[PDB]
Amino acid sequence: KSDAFXXYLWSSK
Amino acid sequence: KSDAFXXYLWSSK
Amino acid sequence: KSDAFXXYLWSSK
Amino acid sequence: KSDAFXXYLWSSK
Amino acid sequence: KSDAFXXYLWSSK
Amino acid sequence: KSDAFXXYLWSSK
Amino acid sequence: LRCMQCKTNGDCRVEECALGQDLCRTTIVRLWEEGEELELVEKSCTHSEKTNRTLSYRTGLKITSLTEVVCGLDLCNQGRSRYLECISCGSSDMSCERGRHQSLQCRSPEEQCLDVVTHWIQKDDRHLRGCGYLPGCPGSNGFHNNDTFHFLKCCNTTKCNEGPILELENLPQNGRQCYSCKGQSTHGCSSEETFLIDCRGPMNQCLVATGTHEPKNQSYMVRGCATASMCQHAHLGDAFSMNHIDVSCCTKSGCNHPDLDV
Amino acid sequence: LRCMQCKTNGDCRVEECALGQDLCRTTIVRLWEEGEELELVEKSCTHSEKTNRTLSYRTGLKITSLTEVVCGLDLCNQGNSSRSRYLECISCGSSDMSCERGRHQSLQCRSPEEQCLDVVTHWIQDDRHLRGCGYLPGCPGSNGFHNNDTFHFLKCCNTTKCNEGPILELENLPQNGRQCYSCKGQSTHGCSSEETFLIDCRGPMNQCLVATGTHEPKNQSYMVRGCATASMCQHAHLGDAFSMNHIDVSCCTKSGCNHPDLD
Amino acid sequence: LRCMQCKTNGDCRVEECALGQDLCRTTIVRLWEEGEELELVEKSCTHSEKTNRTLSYRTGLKITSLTEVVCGLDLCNQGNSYLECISCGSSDMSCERGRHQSLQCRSPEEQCLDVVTHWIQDDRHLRGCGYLPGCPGSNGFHNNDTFHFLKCCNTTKCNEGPILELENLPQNGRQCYSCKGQSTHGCSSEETFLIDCRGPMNQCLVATGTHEPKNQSYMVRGCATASMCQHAHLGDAFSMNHIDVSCCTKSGCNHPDL
Amino acid sequence: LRCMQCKTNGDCRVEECALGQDLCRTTIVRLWEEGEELELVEKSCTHSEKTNRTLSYRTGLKITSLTEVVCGLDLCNQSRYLECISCGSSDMSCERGRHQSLQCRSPEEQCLDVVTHWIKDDRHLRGCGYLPGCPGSNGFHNNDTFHFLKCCNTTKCNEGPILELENLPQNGRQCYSCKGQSTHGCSSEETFLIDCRGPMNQCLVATGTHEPKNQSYMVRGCATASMCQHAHLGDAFSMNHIDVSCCTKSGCNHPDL
Amino acid sequence: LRCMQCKTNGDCRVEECALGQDLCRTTIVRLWEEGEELELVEKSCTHSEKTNRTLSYRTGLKITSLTEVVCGLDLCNQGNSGRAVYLECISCGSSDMSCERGRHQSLQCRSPEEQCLDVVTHWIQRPKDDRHLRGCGYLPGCPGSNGFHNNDTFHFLKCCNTTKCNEGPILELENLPQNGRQCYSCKGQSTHGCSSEETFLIDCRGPMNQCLVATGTHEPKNQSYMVRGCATASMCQHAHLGDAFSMNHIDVSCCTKSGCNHPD
Ligand SMILES: *[C@H]1O[C@H](CO)[C@@H](O[C@@H]2O[C@H](CO)[C@@H](O[C@@H]3O[C@H](CO[C@H]4O[C@H](CO)[C@@H](O)[C@H](O)[C@@H]4O)[C@@H](O)[C@H](O[C@H]4O[C@H](CO)[C@@H](O)[C@H](O)[C@@H]4O)[C@@H]3O)[C@H](O)[C@H]2NC(C)=O)[C@H](O)[C@H]1NC(C)=O
Ligand SMILES: *[C@H]1O[C@H](CO)[C@@H](O[C@@H]2O[C@H](CO)[C@@H](O[C@@H]3O[C@H](CO[C@H]4O[C@H](CO)[C@@H](O)[C@H](O)[C@@H]4O)[C@@H](O)[C@H](O[C@H]4O[C@H](CO)[C@@H](O)[C@H](O)[C@@H]4O)[C@@H]3O)[C@H](O)[C@H]2NC(C)=O)[C@H](O)[C@H]1NC(C)=O
Numbered sequence A, B, C, D, E, F: 001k002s003d004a005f006x007x008y009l010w011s012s013k
Numbered sequence G: 001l002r003c004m005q006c007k008t009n010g011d012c013r014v015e016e017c018a019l020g021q022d023l024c025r026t027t028i029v030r031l032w033e034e035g036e037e038l039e040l041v042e043k044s045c046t047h048s049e050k051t052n053r054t055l056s057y058r059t060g061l062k063i064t065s066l067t068e069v070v071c072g073l074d075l076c077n078q079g080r081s082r083y084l085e086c087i088s089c090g091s092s093d094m095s096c097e098r099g100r101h102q103s104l105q106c107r108s109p110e111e112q113c114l115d116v117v118t119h120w121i122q123k124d125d126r127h128l129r130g131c132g133y134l135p136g137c138p139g140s141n142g143f144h145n146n147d148t149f150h151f152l153k154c155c156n157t158t159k160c161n162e163g164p165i166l167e168l169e170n171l172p173q174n175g176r177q178c179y180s181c182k183g184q185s186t187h188g189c190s191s192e193e194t195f196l197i198d199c200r201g202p203m204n205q206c207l208v209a210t211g212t213h214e215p216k217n218q219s220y221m222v223r224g225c226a227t228a229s230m231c232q233h234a235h236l237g238d239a240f241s242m243n244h245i246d247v248s249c250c251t252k253s254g255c256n257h258p259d260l261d262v
Numbered sequence H: 001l002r003c004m005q006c007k008t009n010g011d012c013r014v015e016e017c018a019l020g021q022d023l024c025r026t027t028i029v030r031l032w033e034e035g036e037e038l039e040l041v042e043k044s045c046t047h048s049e050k051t052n053r054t055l056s057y058r059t060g061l062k063i064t065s066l067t068e069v070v071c072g073l074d075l076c077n078q079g080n081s082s083r084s085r086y087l088e089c090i091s092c093g094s095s096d097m098s099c100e101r102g103r104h105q106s107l108q109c110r111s112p113e114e115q116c117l118d119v120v121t122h123w124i125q126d127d128r129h130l131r132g133c134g135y136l137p138g139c140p141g142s143n144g145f146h147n148n149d150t151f152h153f154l155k156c157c158n159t160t161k162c163n164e165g166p167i168l169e170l171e172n173l174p175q176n177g178r179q180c181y182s183c184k185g186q187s188t189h190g191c192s193s194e195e196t197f198l199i200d201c202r203g204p205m206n207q208c209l210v211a212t213g214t215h216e217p218k219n220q221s222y223m224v225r226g227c228a229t230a231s232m233c234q235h236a237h238l239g240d241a242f243s244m245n246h247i248d249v250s251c252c253t254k255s256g257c258n259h260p261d262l263d
Numbered sequence I: 001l002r003c004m005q006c007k008t009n010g011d012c013r014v015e016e017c018a019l020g021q022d023l024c025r026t027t028i029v030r031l032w033e034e035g036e037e038l039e040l041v042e043k044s045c046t047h048s049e050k051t052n053r054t055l056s057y058r059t060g061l062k063i064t065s066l067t068e069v070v071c072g073l074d075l076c077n078q079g080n081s082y083l084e085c086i087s088c089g090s091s092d093m094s095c096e097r098g099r100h101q102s103l104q105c106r107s108p109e110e111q112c113l114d115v116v117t118h119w120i121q122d123d124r125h126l127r128g129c130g131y132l133p134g135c136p137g138s139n140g141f142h143n144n145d146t147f148h149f150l151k152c153c154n155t156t157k158c159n160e161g162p163i164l165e166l167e168n169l170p171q172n173g174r175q176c177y178s179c180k181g182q183s184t185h186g187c188s189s190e191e192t193f194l195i196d197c198r199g200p201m202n203q204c205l206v207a208t209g210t211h212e213p214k215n216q217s218y219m220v221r222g223c224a225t226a227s228m229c230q231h232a233h234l235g236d237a238f239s240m241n242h243i244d245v246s247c248c249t250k251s252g253c254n255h256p257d258l
Numbered sequence J: 001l002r003c004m005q006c007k008t009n010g011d012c013r014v015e016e017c018a019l020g021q022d023l024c025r026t027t028i029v030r031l032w033e034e035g036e037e038l039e040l041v042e043k044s045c046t047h048s049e050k051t052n053r054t055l056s057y058r059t060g061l062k063i064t065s066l067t068e069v070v071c072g073l074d075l076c077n078q079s080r081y082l083e084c085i086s087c088g089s090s091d092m093s094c095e096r097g098r099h100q101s102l103q104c105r106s107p108e109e110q111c112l113d114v115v116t117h118w119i120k121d122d123r124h125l126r127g128c129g130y131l132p133g134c135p136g137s138n139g140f141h142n143n144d145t146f147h148f149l150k151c152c153n154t155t156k157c158n159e160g161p162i163l164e165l166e167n168l169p170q171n172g173r174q175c176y177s178c179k180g181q182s183t184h185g186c187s188s189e190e191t192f193l194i195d196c197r198g199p200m201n202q203c204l205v206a207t208g209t210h211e212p213k214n215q216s217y218m219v220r221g222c223a224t225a226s227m228c229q230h231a232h233l234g235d236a237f238s239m240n241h242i243d244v245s246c247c248t249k250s251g252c253n254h255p256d257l
Numbered sequence K: 001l002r003c004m005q006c007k008t009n010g011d012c013r014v015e016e017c018a019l020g021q022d023l024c025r026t027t028i029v030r031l032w033e034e035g036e037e038l039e040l041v042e043k044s045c046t047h048s049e050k051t052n053r054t055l056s057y058r059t060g061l062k063i064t065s066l067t068e069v070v071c072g073l074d075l076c077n078q079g080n081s082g083r084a085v086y087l088e089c090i091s092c093g094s095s096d097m098s099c100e101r102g103r104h105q106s107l108q109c110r111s112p113e114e115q116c117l118d119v120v121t122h123w124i125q126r127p128k129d130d131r132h133l134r135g136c137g138y139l140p141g142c143p144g145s146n147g148f149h150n151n152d153t154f155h156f157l158k159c160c161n162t163t164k165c166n167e168g169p170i171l172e173l174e175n176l177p178q179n180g181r182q183c184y185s186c187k188g189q190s191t192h193g194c195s196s197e198e199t200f201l202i203d204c205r206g207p208m209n210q211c212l213v214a215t216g217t218h219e220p221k222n223q224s225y226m227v228r229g230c231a232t233a234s235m236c237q238h239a240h241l242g243d244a245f246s247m248n249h250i251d252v253s254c255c256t257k258s259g260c261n262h263p264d
């Protein structure tokens, strides 16, 4: 499913 | 299915 | 010099 | 021989 | 003191 | 003593 | 919302939360087996009405500690100070039937003393005392019909979970009458298999609960007396051995009559 | 006759034991703090009269335990050497649950040899009272020392919770017959004839002890005189009670016989 | 007193303290080398003087912490024992143009440190977090070869500002003899001379000790704050064994001693 | 010569050999303790008369195996074969453990039998080994002690009853017997004349030191000639410094020479 | 200065350096054999005139490397060693497949400072073998030709900064041109091997146009050995060159004109 990098790029704080 | 916290509350010895 | 077990017998916290 | 804490105060990097 | 191999030959169990 | 690097430089096969 | 999703495996992905699931959770259990300390961590998107909840009990002076923490921000689940003195028993080998005097001080300041009981009227019993934080504490919560008895008290006084084991049969009637049954709508909870019973103690409302069992999507139903709370906090709903659980409570005697179903 | 010798850090060598050392030993202390259990293993040759010996007490349901084991065969302490529930004993004195407020609260000895231990140190001018499980040479029995300044007592017994009861203190020990000189210090000052005087002996401590030892720096000679049980001269572990480095302990029978005398 | 005694390689023993060493200690340093976390632990009997003391500074957003606790009970040693401040002076984060890097102290009693050593004939500068005896306050020593200075305070970021330099500490009125070495070598006579003391360093110091080789009597004479004669951790600035630091109140006394 | 020098704890240095030491050695012991493989490794410069040698015996079907290899170059210490009885391990005593066999793990290995009897702890060991001067019988006795080592190269040849000195026929030879210091133990009238037995047909004196602080200690008795040739036989005596001499004529080991 | 001092077992302490020791060192040897890479790490205070140095050679496509790194800040050698080791060189002389059949076998250097090394020890004849090693390395005073010889021993160390320049025939003492200088040659005690009787004139070869006297020790006891011969001047200048000699506590001296090795 969701990309791991993608997710962090837009979400990781 | 069965939540993991619930289980300790109602089943865990 | 001082005994490990000895020391602990008479002193352990 | 020098102090461990002391040595950090005056010499450590 | 008393050498390693010697010791096994005459003393080891 | 004997230096460790020194020793290998002249000896390590 | 986006959360970390991790099985106890340590297998992890980014999750885009489903609609209705607007919180991420982290559940940790820390326990003692042999002379080893184990840890299980589970993370995921969880449901709207969920909160921080806590549980711990004596095991060998070692304790079994369990924590569930919740938060509403994207990927916010990247994983002797002692307090209220409580009775602890019910662990692998210290039965409540056997060591009701035996304390543990709670390690969170929010947590209260717990007593949780399940009895089967005439399957093994369960009793557990220790520390925990639960929504709608402190108070007494419970359900009984003719076959089952579930109960959960949480309180915030020193050792207040001391006492003999709470039995249903030791509780006064409260003057409420509800219908009782357990089983399928055609077997156990059928119309002529459902009958009135007198509700005891704090359980002064009427409950019907629906859900599923094994080995399929076999619909299941339970009717009995309850605290209103049994319908309000899924952790109390978890007492019922039912998957997709739907719980309803209503105030007036007989109000859980099958024909009044909503 | 050869044993492993290991410091606490897992640093070992093979040793040739000295003349009076025909046993190998292994000492394991298991302690706690923070979450963690900590191990500490020492190994070496040791004198031929030593024996297996152990102590343990409650720390939080986590059990603190010392263990020393002994064996007579070439390198038999090489390597890393749970049933539980045997004799039931009062445990306390642990850091947190102090025997005073640490009430009763039992502990099941995890070995059949283990007895109930009560060990106490009291300064007459910070006190230690520890109860738990353990085994010592000369167990069971009551063991002890007192002078005007110090009190040391070790009791082991082999019945259920036989170490239950009030903090043992010297004044509650009835006076026996004997009387010995009491002193602590150097030969020239503390233990001379200045601070040396007869004291009334209390319980099973009916004999007169003179212990001599050393203190740093300069390996400075130090002395202790008082009342004692005979065992106080019989067991190295009992003499470990004394705060001094090389220990020589003497008993004699009749009152006052530990006057500044002999050797 | 008995303590646990442990070398940093974790070789341990129970030990009876020497006369007048009525405390146990636990010195623990945590630091970062590469992407790896190191820890060094030392336990021993220590002199009844010592107290709890602490030091921290930035290393890469990774910190180097140094902790030392002390206690007076048998084997109390057996375990393993806020304010914003400037922090610079690590091997590759200099105070010279590192003056602005900040750091939240990890203990509530920790204060901000400025410690400086300057020579002219290497120079060390360090700022961070610390808990030392007799803080807050300014401490220091100077003679004609060496400047040592230590500042601690309890207000936010007070250790900020330019590198402290001797030259811009205004002269005191008080004056002291300056020398460095053995007696007859560098602490001879007229080999030792008067200097104008500056700053809080308004007393006269002389300190005797030993540099390696094995035993070689070394001396230092200079201007110092009264502190330098009081606290061992201030005395440590002089790199020497068997230290004896005497301070006199009036100006002049340094050359005819014991 | 330079060798690696390595303590058992893994503390290594490069070592320049002393004058009489033209060899490197590696001694390795592999064993089982409580279901755990253990190892111990020692490297150093060694004396030029030394050689490759080997030892193993059963301990649980797990084995203890010992190796010393040797070589004469700078930093040079940087399949079943012969069948043998093995016993004498920590309680598989040779008396109950007789009949237990072991295939030697090396081609050179022979069947070993080694016995010490005090006339106290009795040691008996059968296993595999490679020692200088094999095959052959070797030993020593006086009034208090009996040391024996027998190596051989046929199958299970180390089988048989425990070797007992009383089963070794009289030699014709006789030698003096003493044990200890030459003031208490090896005096005169304290030293006396005994009947040699078996292949132990030469008279032997051996002096050396004990542990820890040096005391002049000696032993005299009946011996096989090899007792004076090989260090690994002289190791039977447990003596830190060690000198051992044998002669051929009845009575020659008298206190004097 | 304080340094970490560590033995090969990971057993450390904090060390105060002695007076002429304002550097910390780390020495890492990476070796092989049966199949596994063994790492050997040693740390301590060291002398001020020391520097980084390095040696590498092929052992099976697996590489043997020595690495010594030096630094002068407080505890700068703390913390372990994923940290440590461009020019292509001949590598040979490792145990099997030596420099006879191993010439032309190439190794690329890790690290730009590394040069091509050629190191040789030859005995002039209880038989003892020669050593011929080519590989990467860095040494103080590189590049250059360093060496010693007498009637008994030949030691040579050549490092060079060009491609594959350590390639070619095995260096032998006889192929080095006689240079015209004359030195006294001996080995042993000053009363057995190096006394006025065994000491004689040899003619010097190659870039070894200076006379060397080396004194040192053997065990047992502190018995003193001596070596007299021809030598390159750097032989007196770099500790690492003197390590060639089979003695401890070394002191080496060079002099200028022929024959300046009187028995004393
Ligand atoms: C070993 O065994 C015991 C264990 O301590 C010792 O017994 C102590 O002995 C000392 C004397 O050597 C006793 O001290 C004396 O106590 C008197 C009373 O103290 C209390 O009560 C008064 C009221 O009277 C209060 O004011 C006071 O605050 C206390 O609460 C004191 O009056 C004596 O003091 C002094 O008298 C003059 C005054 O003119 C003083 O200026 C002097 O300093 C002088 O000392 C004195 O302090 C102590 O009470 C005993 N303790 C107990 C528990 O009995 C043994 O002495 C010792 N055996 C030896 C060494 O032989
Ligand atoms: C403690 O306090 C300070 C420590 O810093 C010392 O002060 C120094 O004193 C020394 C001499 O005692 C000074 O050195 C002298 O400097 C003179 C001028 O320096 C210039 O030299 C050239 C050209 O002008 C430039 O390179 C340089 O930058 C300066 O401009 C020189 O004239 C002296 O040199 C030489 O003089 C004769 C001439 O024939 C020569 O034969 C010798 O080579 C001699 O060296 C000399 O170098 C030094 O500059 C001072 N430093 C400072 C910072 O002021 C104190 O000495 C000290 N007090 C005590 C006694 O403890």
Ligand SMILES: *[C@H]1O[C@H](CO)[C@@H](O[C@@H]2O[C@H](CO)[C@@H](O[C@@H]3O[C@H](CO[C@H]4O[C@H](CO)[C@@H](O)[C@H](O)[C@@H]4O)[C@@H](O)[C@H](O[C@H]4O[C@H](CO)[C@@H](O)[C@H](O)[C@@H]4O)[C@@H]3O)[C@H](O)[C@H]2NC(C)=O)[C@H](O)[C@H]1NC(C)=O
Pocket: J119, J143, J144, J192
């Ligand atoms: C080296 O070689 C051997 C070692 O094995 C030594 O031989 C031993 O010599 C000793 C004494 O020299 C012998 O011991 C003697 O045994 C006698 C018999 O004892 C057994 O039988 C009797 C009944 O006859 C039982 O009572 C007893 O329990 C035994 O089972 C005893 O008679 C002797 O003891 C004592 O006699 C008088 C009685 O009035 C007592 O007062 C004394 O205690 C006296 O000791 C004695 O014990 C022993 O038998 C020999 N061992 C053997 C043959 O196996 C050599 O001595 C030694 N060579 C040297 C040193 O030169």
Ligand SMILES: *[C@H]1O[C@H](CO)[C@@H](O[C@@H]2O[C@H](CO)[C@@H](O[C@@H]3O[C@H](CO[C@H]4O[C@H](CO)[C@@H](O)[C@H](O)[C@@H]4O)[C@@H](O)[C@H](O[C@H]4O[C@H](CO)[C@@H](O)[C@H](O)[C@@H]4O)[C@@H]3O)[C@H](O)[C@H]2NC(C)=O)[C@H](O)[C@H]1NC(C)=O
Pocket: K124, K125, K151, K152, K200
């Ligand atoms: C340092 O430099 C070199 C180091 O190698 C030395 O040079 C050697 O010197 C020795 C001794 O002076 C020389 O040995 C002598 O030479 C003859 C060898 O010829 C024989 O060689 C072959 C080998 O293939 C033999 O099989 C065959 O017999 C040859 O004829 C011998 O004739 C001499 O031997 C002896 O003769 C009588 C027999 O009647 C013997 O009883 C004596 O022992 C006598 O020695 C002898 O072996 C050797 O050849 C040189 N080697 C070379 C040049 O390669 C230097 O001497 C040394 N510098 C010093 C010490 O100053």
Ligand SMILES: *[C@@H]1O[C@H](CO[C@H]2O[C@H](C)[C@@H](O)[C@@H](O)[C@@H]2O)[C@@H](O[C@@H]2O[C@H](CO)[C@@H](O)[C@H](O)[C@H]2NC(C)=O)[C@H](O)[C@H]1NC(C)=O
Pocket: G052, G054, G067, G069, G070, G108, G109, G110
């Ligand atoms: C949900 O729980 C988190 C963390 O819960 C731990 O901390 C509480 C106080 C303690 O009782 C433990 O039992 C729990 O395990 C809470 O998050 C806190 O949020 C603040 C920011 O406002 C942070 O500064 C805190 O550090 C953080 N707590 C910690 C120690 O991680 C949170 O309060 C709670 N949600 C609730 C009750 O609303």
Ligand SMILES: *[C@@H]1O[C@H](CO[C@H]2O[C@H](C)[C@@H](O)[C@@H](O)[C@@H]2O)[C@@H](O[C@@H]2O[C@H](CO)[C@@H](O)[C@H](O)[C@H]2NC(C)=O)[C@H](O)[C@H]1NC(C)=O
Pocket: J051, J052, J054, J069, J070, J106, J107, J108
């Ligand atoms: C000492 O032993 C070595 C090798 O080790 C031996 O181990 C046991 C005892 C035996 O069963 C064999 O496995 C080995 O022989 C001898 O040989 C050297 O070791 C290596 C190991 O592979 C081989 O390459 C060679 O055979 C040899 N090395 C070389 C080429 O130089 C060694 O010869 C022996 N020494 C004696 C005393 O004979």
Ligand SMILES: *[C@@H]1O[C@H](CO)[C@@H](O[C@@H]2O[C@H](CO)[C@@H](O)[C@H](O)[C@H]2NC(C)=O)[C@H](O)[C@H]1NC(C)=O
Pocket: H140, H158, H159
């Ligand atoms: C506990 O200790 C007692 C001693 O106090 C042991 O009993 C003694 O020894 C024998 C053994 O049969 C008895 O006949 C005596 O009554 C005891 N001696 C005396 C004089 O009191 C007893 O064996 C021990 N039991 C355990 C738990 O091992």
Ligand SMILES: *[C@@H]1O[C@H](CO[C@H]2O[C@H](C)[C@@H](O)[C@@H](O)[C@@H]2O)[C@@H](O)[C@H](O)[C@H]1NC(C)=O
Pocket: G138, G139, G140, G154, G155, G156, G157, G160
């Ligand atoms: C906590 O204390 C109050 C309740 O305490 C009781 O809890 C249960 C219901 C009873 O069975 C009793 O045993 C307890 O005494 C709460 O009303 C209140 O919200 C809390 N107050 C505090 C102290 O924070």
Ligand SMILES: *[C@@H]1O[C@H](CO[C@H]2O[C@H](C)[C@@H](O)[C@@H](O)[C@@H]2O)[C@@H](O)[C@H](O)[C@H]1NC(C)=O
Pocket: H052, H054, H067, H069, H070, H110, H111, H112, H113
């Ligand atoms: C010395 O101790 C050895 C074993 O030690 C443990 O054995 C079991 C597990 C328990 O009893 C533990 O408490 C012991 O520490 C024995 O095998 C050995 O025999 C002992 N010595 C004697 C003669 O008792």
Ligand SMILES: *[C@@H]1O[C@H](CO[C@H]2O[C@H](C)[C@@H](O)[C@@H](O)[C@@H]2O)[C@@H](O)[C@H](O)[C@H]1NC(C)=O
Pocket: I051, I052, I053, I054, I067, I068, I069, I070, I081, I107, I108
């Ligand atoms: C000495 O420190 C003890 C340990 O606890 C402290 O450790 C260091 C000093 C700091 O990081 C503190 O924040 C910790 O609380 C104390 O328990 C003890 O009381 C201290 N002794 C003194 C001087 O009061």
Ligand SMILES: *[C@@H]1O[C@H](CO[C@H]2O[C@H](C)[C@@H](O)[C@@H](O)[C@@H]2O)[C@@H](O)[C@H](O)[C@H]1NC(C)=O
Pocket: K052, K054, K067, K069, K070, K083, K084, K085, K110, K111, K112, K113
């Ligand atoms: C000494 O060595 C330090 C690090 O050396 C390693 O990294 C370099 C870049 C490589 O070439 C490897 O061979 C080394 O293992 C340097 O940081 C230090 O500056 C060096 N000293 C010098 C050259 O002055």
Ligand SMILES: *[C@@H]1O[C@H](CO[C@H]2O[C@H](C)[C@@H](O)[C@@H](O)[C@@H]2O)[C@@H](O)[C@H](O)[C@H]1NC(C)=O
Pocket: K215, K216, K217, K222, K224, K225, K249
């Ligand atoms: C022995 O070793 C060191 C070597 O110093 C020697 O130097 C030359 C070769 C001789 O002629 C003698 O002057 C010296 O023995 C000594 O520095 C060292 O102190 C000696 N002993 C020890 C402790 O190893």
Ligand SMILES: *[C@@H]1O[C@H](CO)[C@@H](O)[C@H](O)[C@H]1NC(C)=O
Pocket: G121, G122, G146, G195
């Ligand atoms: C429900 O109560 C009991 C359970 O013990 C059961 O025996 C009975 O059949 C039920 N009661 C009636 C009479 O409906």
Ligand SMILES: *[C@@H]1O[C@H](CO)[C@@H](O)[C@H](O)[C@H]1NC(C)=O
Pocket: H214, H219, H246
């Ligand atoms: C100091 O202690 C005792 C004094 O009784 C003595 O046996 C020991 O040898 C002394 N230690 C040394 C070597 O100074």
Ligand SMILES: *[C@@H]1O[C@H](CO)[C@@H](O)[C@H](O)[C@H]1NC(C)=O
Pocket: J135, J153
């Ligand atoms: C055993 O010894 C014999 C006798 O010389 C010899 O032939 C043989 O090599 C040895 N071992 C065997 C059987 O290989």
Ligand SMILES: *[C@@H]1O[C@H](CO)[C@@H](O)[C@H](O)[C@H]1NC(C)=O
Pocket: K142, K143, K161
């Ligand atoms: C190789 O490089 C060195 C410096 O490392 C320098 O002297 C010169 O450029 C080269 N030397 C030669 C040609 O040997």
Ligand SMILES: *[C@H]1O[C@H](CO)[C@@H](O)[C@H](O)[C@H]1NC(C)=O
Pocket: I135, I136, I154
């Ligand atoms: C720092 O300042 C306070 C006032 O805030 C003052 O009482 C004292 O001098 C200092 N206190 C400490 C020790 O932090």
Ligand SMILES: *[C@H]1O[C@H](CO)[C@@H](O)[C@H](O)[C@H]1NC(C)=O
Pocket: J209, J214, J241
């Ligand atoms: C004692 O033994 C001998 C003398 O017999 C001597 O050479 C040596 O120095 C001493 N050995 C030890 C280990 O002290």
